[PDB]
Design a protein around this ligand. Structure first.
Ligand SMILES: C[C@H](CCC(=O)NCCC[N+](C)(C)CCCS(=O)(=O)[O-])[C@H]1CC[C@H]2[C@@H]3[C@H](O)C[C@@H]4C[C@H](O)CC[C@]4(C)[C@H]3C[C@H](O)[C@]12C
Ligand SMILES: Nc1ncnc2c1ncn2[C@@H]1O[C@H](COP(=O)(O)OP(=O)(O)O)[C@@H](O)[C@H]1O
Ligand SMILES: CCc1nn(CC(=O)Nc2ccncn2)c(=O)c2cc3sccc3n12
Lengths: 483, 341, 127
């Protein structure tokens, strides 16, 4: 079902809906063709189904990242602006809507994570990330923190991680290189290492979430936090003299926040290609068109070159666009869902529980090896406790071979093997001897030799030591001795 | 059938039958003789018989010769012939080839678990490359084959207008072997649809050859590599092929393939990138307890995968099982995930 | 026997080969079965075939006999030093007796022949 004869627009209700409708109504009066604007809930879930049917809107207003998924499915029409139109919008936003070389949507507005600060505590924010530690120490003397932000959401840590040459997916010729991921290289490692060190130095905790960072800022406990324009509406109620600026540099480079570009896509099945194109190109993407939208709900930084100059009167918007210009276009490839997960489990665990070098190393700790090494280390000393005339390590190389016989001498290896024949293996082996004969020493040597890969390498994956001296008979427990 | 009495009784009833679609025989301690000849002579005239199953019984080469003669009958009409653990040797391949060269009704031939060594293949290929051979499905699983035989199988893949299903797993068709098959399977005109390189000892080295085929051959819909120690590097290379926009592979089976945590990134990429993949049977391998959590998270964004996601024969923690159960309930279009329980 | 397949291919297309000596090779009965494919094929102009001491048994005579029957060019057949006993000779004779058989020289030299098979040879000699 194609809605021929009319132009239909779907947009999130949290956007300048009434304004866009005004642009539509003006368009109608100027051209004679009516434009209908609707704002259904979860349009990002329903649009893909109607677009795949031919039903639904002609124009879709949403984030440019999701549009890449539609483009892969072929649910969006190609847009065909000339250079006369392409040069109207910022030169870096055209990549936001570029899928494998094709343009699939018109950039409308540009979001970025800017630095939000409290002029009452810090009228002069630092220009270098390295200065924050010192700032925090000075503020701590005053009882305030230099910087607090959400560290449980990688979206806000990225600006720093990518600062030293790190990147998500390489963007070379208009197409993202899916197999080339920049979260692993030195540029990312240096950034993350620095961030983790800031946590260890108690400038930031590891568990700050969105609500905590905002509450602390709006309360006056922190000099500054990091956020996007979407949150500005909740920063006025504090009546704090706040400002917005460009984030600090790292080793000479600017931070690189993910840049989220709002764009207007067109339905693949719609015949209203010239109609949708002219609507967006010569009416909406104008200073007057954007004012109609901004009038209802502020767009923050906008894709229009001329409109941003008009809005330069507000430094918050100027800072946002400056950050976006220096930032990284957030890739529109569906592989980002994997990326977001990959960083979510990177930053949180890197902050506490393992090192930043460990984090990227294929989860090399597969437990089996982790335990073997734990055992290898733990049993290097004959006692690994006090009482040795200075507590020096005796060194287990001092072990002198004890005689082992069956109730010819035998070896520690082949100990659990079947006897002469019958294919009958032994599960239980008992080592008997007088107290002081070396029962414990043999057991400790055995575990060390196993951990080092010199005994029972193929037969056992785990050895669990039960020290009968430590295990009581009356204490209730499950088989937690394994822990 | 046990004794001569059973042969004349079975012969009588089968001959006087006008609606038997499938016959399964099981010669017991009687062949390697003409003892069964009397019955095979009946099968030749049964116009309603489409499937003849002679698997898992001793049918010595001489017996296979008798059968082949009975399959050259103008009125044979047998479309499916199953010859599993029959104890056949390369000697019978000559007689099979003769049948393929004239019997235009035979479509599915299963020669698995016979000693049809490389030489035997060389002979079967004579029939397979011959016009009038309409064979579509061929199983050569566990036939004591080596890479040498791929030189002839590859020629069949290149010229056959009819062969679509080729299963050559459980053999020594290692890296060099598959590379030969790939070189010809690569051709856009190859009619190969299902490639059963199940357990051929394949390694990461040859995955570039499989990748090439996946990239170019748009007719290949099913690829089974389970049991090959492909490794993580192997998956990486295969993915490069699978991520190519022209790849049409629908089903990829990867059971124990000596996989580890690293490959999860490439598999995750595969899950969301390919528009063709429908089934990805990751099996008994150490995929990783965190690796699978990435799958859980990404398989929400309108993934095209609908079928088995594997993850069987793999131990997962509580939170992981919960996430997988949640996925199964939230996205019913994914038939079944298939956890261990 | 593995090479017999490739020999057969040559016989099927090489119209110049006249004399082929495959003596003292392990071209068992199966190998003969394959060579006979080429030998029974038109364009095969082979006139002399030596299969002396090739680990053959009487079973192979079923195919050699067919070659003798249909081959327009095979005149020399040497199959001695094999296990082509009485029953094998009888099989060959049943086709060699045909007035149209082109066999000129028959080398049943040392094949374990006995008095029993002599009637079969007698038939061939008479016809
Ligand atoms: C997206 C990249 C993969 C691509 C990559 O790493 N590409 C370049 C590497 C090779 N280079 C030679 C170019 C550089 C060497 C770095 S070196 O530091 O040696 O100089 C890899 C690298 C580290 C990977 C994570 C960890 O595994 C831990 C964990 C394992 C689980 O299962 C799945 C989840 C998780 C969080 C993983 C996600 C993802 O999978 C990451 C980010
Ligand atoms: N080479 C050795 N082999 C065994 N025991 C040794 C050796 N050298 C010193 N010892 C000492 O012998 C004692 C053996 O204690 P043991 O009777 O095995 O302990 P438990 O009663 O806990 O089994 C310890 O004091 C230990 O340090
Ligand atoms: C010197 C005493 C001693 N003797 N023996 C031998 C022994 O116990 N023989 C039998 C025989 C029959 N029944 C019981 N014991 C030890 O083994 C021994 C160990 C540890 S520690 C301190 C002295 C000691 N010790």
């Amino acid at each position: 079902k194609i809605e021929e004869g009319k132009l239909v627009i779907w947009i999130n209700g949290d956007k300048g809906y009434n304004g866009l409708a005004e642009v539509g109504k003006k368009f109608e009066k100027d051209t004679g063709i009516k434009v209908t604007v609707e704002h259904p809930d979860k349009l990002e879930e329903k649009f893909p189904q109607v677009a795949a049917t031919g039903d639904g809107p002609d124009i879709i207003f949403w984030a440019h990242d999701r549009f890449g998924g539609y483009a892969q499915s072929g649910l969006l029409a190609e847009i065909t602006p000339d250079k006369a139109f392409q040069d109207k919008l910022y030169p870096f936003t055209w990549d936001a809507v570029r899928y494998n070389g094709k343009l699939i949507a018109y950039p409308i507005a540009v979001e970025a994570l800017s630095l939000i600060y409290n002029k009452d505590l810090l009228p002069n924010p630092p220009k270098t990330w390295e200065e924050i530690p010192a700032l925090d120490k000075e503020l701590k003397a005053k009882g305030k923190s230099a910087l607090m932000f959400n560290l449980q959401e990688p979206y806000f840590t990225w600006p720093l991680i990518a600062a030293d040459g790190g990147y998500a997916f390489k963007y070379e010729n208009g197409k993202y290189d899916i197999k080339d991921v920049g979260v692993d290289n030195a540029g990312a490692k240096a950034g993350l290492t620095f961030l983790v060190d800031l946590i260890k130095n108690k400038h930031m905790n590891a568990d700050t979430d969105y609500s905590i960072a905002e509450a602390a800022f709006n309360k006056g406990e922190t000099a500054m936090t990091i956020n996007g324009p979407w949150a500005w509406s909740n920063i006025d109620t504090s009546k704090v003299n706040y400002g917005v600026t460009v984030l600090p540099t790292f080793k000479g480079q600017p931070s690189k926040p993910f840049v989220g570009v709002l764009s207007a896509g067109i339905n693949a099945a719609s015949p209203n290609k010239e109609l949708a194109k002219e609507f967006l190109e010569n009416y909406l993407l104008t200073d007057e068109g954007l004012e109609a939208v901004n009038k209802d709900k502020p767009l923050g930084a906008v894709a229009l070159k001329s409109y941003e100059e008009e809005l330069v009167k507000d430094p918050r918007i100027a800072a946002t666009m400056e950050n976006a210009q220096k930032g990284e276009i957030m890739p529109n490839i569906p592989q980002m869902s994997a990326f977001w997960y990959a960083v979510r489990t990177a930053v949180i665990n890197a902050a506490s529980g393992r090192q930043t070098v460990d984090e990227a190393l294929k989860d090399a700790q597969t437990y089996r090896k982790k335990y073997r090494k734990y055992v290898r280390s733990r049993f290097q000393c004959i006692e690994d406790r006090n009482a040795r005339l200075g507590e020096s390590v005796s060194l287990n190389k001092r072990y002198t071979r004890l005689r082992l016989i069956k109730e010819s001498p035998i070896k520690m290896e082949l100990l659990f093997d079947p006897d002469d024949e019958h294919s009958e293996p032994v599960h239980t082996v008992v080592f008997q001897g007088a107290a002081g004969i070396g029962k414990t020493i043999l057991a400790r040597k055995m575990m060390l030799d196993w951990a080092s890969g010199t005994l029972y390498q193929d037969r056992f994956d785990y050895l669990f030591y039960i020290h009968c001296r430590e295990v009581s008979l009356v204490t209730q427990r499950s088989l937690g001795d394994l822990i | 059938l046990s004794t001569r009495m059973d042969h004349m009784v079975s012969s009588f009833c089968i001959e006087n039958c006008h609606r038997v679609e499938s016959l399964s025989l099981g010669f017991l301690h009687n062949l390697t003789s003409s003892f069964c000849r009397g019955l095979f002579s009946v099968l030749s005239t049964s116009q309603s018989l489409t499937e003849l199953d002679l698997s898992d019984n001793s049918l010595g080469d001489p017996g296979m010769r008798v059968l082949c003669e009975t399959l050259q009958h103008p009125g044979c009409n047998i479309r499916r012939l199953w010859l599993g653990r029959c104890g056949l040797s390369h000697e019978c391949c000559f007689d099979i080839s003769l049948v393929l060269s004239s019997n235009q009704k035979l479509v599915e031939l299963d020669l698995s678990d016979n000693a049809l060594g490389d030489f035997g293949i060389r002979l079967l290929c004579v029939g397979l490359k011959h016009l009038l051979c309409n064979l579509k499905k061929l199983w050569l699983v566990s036939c004591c084959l080596t890479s040498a035989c791929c030189q002839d199988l590859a020629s069949v893949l290149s010229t056959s207008h009819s062969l679509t299903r080729l299963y050559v797993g459980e053999n020594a068709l290692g890296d060099s072997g598959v590379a030969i098959l790939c070189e010809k399977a690569k051709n856009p005109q190859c009619n190969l649809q299902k490639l059963g390189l199940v357990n051929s000892g394949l390694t990461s080295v040859c995955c570039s050859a499989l990748s090439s085929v996946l990239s170019t051959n748009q007719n290949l819909t099913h690829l089974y590599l389970r049991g090959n120690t492909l490794g993580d590097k192997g998956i990486k290379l295969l993915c490069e092929g699978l991520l190519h926009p022209d790849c049409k592979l629908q089903v990829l089976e990867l059971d124990n393939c000596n996989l580890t945590s690293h490959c999860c990134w490439d598999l995750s990429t595969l899950l969301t990138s390919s528009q063709s993949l429908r089934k990805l049977s990751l099996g008994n391998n150490d995929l990783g307890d965190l690796g699978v959590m990435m799958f859980c998270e990404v398989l929400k964004q309108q993934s095209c995968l609908l079928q088995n996601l594997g993850l069987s024969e793999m131990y997962f923690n509580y939170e992981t099982k919960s996430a997988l159960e949640t996925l199964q309930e939230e996205k019913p279009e994914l038939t079944v995930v298939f956890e261990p329980s």
